[PDB]
Ligand SMILES: Cc1cc2nc3c(=O)[nH]c(=O)nc-3n(C[C@H](O)[C@H](O)[C@H](O)COP(=O)(O)OP(=O)(O)OC[C@H]3O[C@@H](n4cnc5c(N)ncnc54)[C@H](O)[C@@H]3O)c2cc1C
Ligand SMILES: Cc1cc2nc3c(=O)[nH]c(=O)nc-3n(C[C@H](O)[C@H](O)[C@H](O)COP(=O)(O)OP(=O)(O)OC[C@H]3O[C@@H](n4cnc5c(N)ncnc54)[C@H](O)[C@@H]3O)c2cc1C
Ligand SMILES: CN1CCN(C(=O)Nc2ccccc2)CC1
């Protein structure tokens with residue numbers, strides 16, 4: 004049996020790796036091999052062909068949040084005249100999980116067929132690692148002593164293996180799960196603790212809250228004072244209130260110290276403070292770390308950053324000339340469309356004689372909390388460090404429909420942050436139904452260097468939430484040399 | 493007799509914007525006239541305007557209510573179980589909640605008048621007595637009792653529009669959207685007449701709240717509903733309305749309506765076909781509301797179509813008399829009337845002329861599912877530009893393969909000047925489309941090109957990211973003719 008040779012070998016058939024591989028083969032006629040550890044979703048390795056987003060990430064979690072939203076819809080419908088037997092309502096988690104599994108598997112199968120049909124784009128099943136500057140080895144397991152399935156000669160090598168959940172080293176950590184296992188729970192937990200203040204903890208808190216059996220309770224804990232670091236602070240505070248209003252208990256300034264099993268098999272959590280909580284599931288969502296351990300990067304000398312991700316320049320190049328890295332493995336912005344963009348730019352540069360680097364600024368993104376967040380660009384306290392004068396335009400109100408629905412706690416927040424010296428829009432931050440859909444074209448605006456006057460001159464679409472972005476002409480307040488104040492001096 | 497800088501006839505979308513801005517931003521003395529202080533019969537529109545009282549605001553609440561018919565059925569695919577036989581749609585509860593919200597807005601505008609210096613409200617019917625005198629009378633009759641005589645340096649006509657009713661035998665047994673907002677019971681069988689957004693939106697409202705055995709029919713005299721919107725979307729919304737149980741009768745037009753002994757209506761179409769319904773709602777158009785203004789007293793000129801004629805700065809032919817909003821018979825949208833009112837006041841009472849831009853105005857249809865659009869449709873672009881490219885994406889979103897509403901294709905189209913990539917129009921059909929389109933309207937004011945969309949990083953997973961995923965045209969227009977490939 005002989006080794007096979009390629010222009011490009013991609014380790015990791017995920018969001019970025021598949022974009023790079025497909026573009027290299029179909030746009031530029033190169034011979035490409037792509038390596039992944041599993042052909043469809045789930046245990047044992049969870050991620051698989053298609054990547055983390057497709058298998059245990061954006062795609063299934065969005066379907067599950069959509070399912071969770073129906074708890075709100077069913078209740079809110081009564082204000083509009085809908086009547087039905089409320090005591091008959093049940094949330095069948097097994098049906099949700101089965102429908103999600105079938106959708107993800109359909110995507111898996113379609114990716115499998117792309118490889119069969121596409122000239123110069125081949126898929127190899129196994130664990131990829133670096134043997135030398137121009138040889139990728141594919142083994143049966145992540146153990147470098149496991150059997151060799153293939154050796155792939157490569158002129159160019161792309162590392163795109165993504166990330167993995169981080170688990171804290173506390174006694175009893177073996178009684179806990181991550182988001183990977185959450186996607187496959189046989190039954191919805193009656194009592195669950197989600198640990199972490201980031202988007203995965205918050206999103207799963209919403210999902211469990213809707214599907215919990217009778218008498219259930221969802222608790223989210225976070226070790227610092229206010230969840231969702233990195234997002235607009237008004238929105239951080241409001242999401243906390245609206246989660247609380249829908250029955251989720253938020254424990255800030257708390258952190259698990261150990262976990263043990265009660266005699267009935269439930270989990271007994273003791274926090275560093277000495278508080279205790281009995282739950283049926285502990286889901287850790289305290290961060291994700293780049294997946295570099297299994298690549299054997301020492302064999303070729305690829306440098307990692309202090310944080311632990313592959314060091315890259317603006318063109319995704321490592322310190323080894325023909326070896327590149329994109330996506331979560333670079334430990335920067337961990338978003339699927341950023342990995343895809345980096346992959347396309349890399350391939351245009353290397354094989355297309357059209358150099359291009361990814362712009363990591365002004366990236367629009369969302370949190371599918373209930374209600375959701377959409378954001379693009381800088382938060383005001385960051386802007387205040389860079390610009391002498393910052394203006395903040397802010398509208399916050401319960402929309403009229405939620406005065407009828409009964410969910411009066413659902414305040415919509417729209418904020419625009421500007422460089423007041425010239426009006427340029429530095430960031431836009433939204434909380435409320437539709438926010439992830441509204442924010443997409445906002446990203447186009449910011450890439451075109453829109454000013455606040457460009458928004459205000461635009462005629463609103465009425466009645467919408469989005470029109471609030473086009474009706475703000477006077478700052479709510481300012482930052483002058485870093486200092487917050489209602490008026491300029 | 494009382495003296496004012498500005499007298500506004502019509503306390504509506506544009507008239508309230510103009511009056512409030514004149515008083516608070518320019519310190520002027522302002523009087524505003526309307527015929528009713530709160531919503532509903534007998535005059536329907538009132539303080540706040542058509543949008544507030546019998547327009548955008550209440551109809552959006554009722555469309556939201558109607559969407560729950562879809563949400564309840566679609567929840568099942570995501571594991572929600574309940575007793576489907578127990579579901580019923582209480583129209584009376586919907587109407588009462590709508591009435592309370594509108595009334596709250598009416599009261600809010602009252603207090604705005606009580607709280608604002610130099611801004612006064614007068615109840616009654618305004619007309620032009622002379623070039624600088626506005627008379628307020630008890631009724632629309634120009635011989636009813638005078639209540640006020642208002643002299644004005646400047647007069648603003650802002651009386652809006654009114655439903656058009658065809659001259660057919662039995663038209664008196666039909667209603668318009670005005671009465672639809674106040675029906676005591678949801679009609680079991682209803683015919684909505686017209687192909688425009690009001691007919692389409694009410695068809696979806698009635699379809700969700702109809703009692704058992706009910707049926708909604710929409711008829712339209714030409715071949716395809718929603719003229720002026722993107723053709724792909726006109727066809728798809730036809731298909732998706734049909735998929736939800738609405739009967740679309742194209743190339744049909746009522747010729748007469750008669751009374752049945754049980755109180756229902758017998759409609760006879762020009763083709764000879766007949767249909768018995770409980771309610772016939774006419775939504776074939778709205779026309780400028782000019783008859784009660786006595787424009788003959790001063791000589792304000794109308795267009796052949798019946799709008800008050802204006803220049804780009806909303807000026808009539810009579811100096812110091814202006815017109816904005818639906819009475820000018822242009823774009824009949826609330827945000828446009830607001831923009832015109834503010835531009836007018838900035839011009840007259842400030843030192844910077846401003847004119848409203850009527851191009852690239854984003855708008856929506858709250859059909860189920862809804863439409864969002866901004867800018868030119870491809871056949872209008874093809875007449876103005878030598879080379880037009882159309883970028884098209886149309887698919888059923890993954891969630892609706894699970895929900896069971898597989899008919900709900902999302903449609904996204906981008907129309908460009910292919911000579912330089914400039915985006916000329918964007919057209920959307922699907923959940924969230926009115927919200928997605930708003931910032932697209934900002935993009936078109938930054939001369940966005942298709943590559944500006946495609947080079948922007950998407951937000952995933954959303955429907956909106958489709959707008960940033962389209963690189964290659966689906967087809968073209970060259971010198972006005974449609975073709976798949978360039979020549
Ligand atoms: C729960 C969750 C929700 C998320 N939601 C969103 C969202 O809504 N929006 C968003 O933009 N992002 C979201 N993300 C992030 C998104 O999933 C990642 O940013 C994106 O998938 C990273 O792409 P990538 O190409 O770096 O790697 P991935 O898509 O992770 O692909 C890496 C692949 O490498 C394979 N692999 C690993 N090691 C090896 C090896 N040695 N040999 C061969 N193959 C290997 C893995 O099996 C995997 O398939 C979410 C993530 C999670 C965990
Ligand atoms: C069913 C329906 C739905 C709509 N939905 C939308 C939508 O979703 N979005 C949108 O943008 N637009 C919508 N519109 C259009 C919108 O309502 C109008 O464009 C807007 O209200 C017109 O503003 P205006 O200032 O011209 O007049 P209006 O807001 O109509 O106000 C005119 C006022 O003048 C008063 N008046 C009339 N004659 C006299 C007189 N002689 N003396 C004193 N007062 C008088 C009337 O009582 C009324 O209050 C809708 C319209 C309808 C009918
Ligand atoms: C221009 N916008 C209009 C909407 N809006 C509100 O204040 N709305 C509102 C609705 C119901 C109760 C309270 C407030 C913000 C400004």
Ligand SMILES: CN1CCN(C(=O)Nc2ccccc2)CC1
Pocket residue numbers: 885887888889890893958961
């Ligand atoms: C970039 N987009 C992604 C979405 N998309 C689809 O076709 N969606 C789809 C729907 C159901 C099953 C499979 C795919 C168009 C292209």
Ligand SMILES: [Br-]
Pocket residue numbers: 094095096097098190191
């Ligand atoms: Br279950």
Ligand SMILES: [Br-]
Pocket residue numbers: 455456459476
């Ligand atoms: Br401005």
Ligand SMILES: [Br-]
Pocket residue numbers: 685686687711712713714745776
């Ligand atoms: Br018609």
Ligand SMILES: [Br-]
Pocket residue numbers: 714715716717719
């Ligand atoms: Br037609």
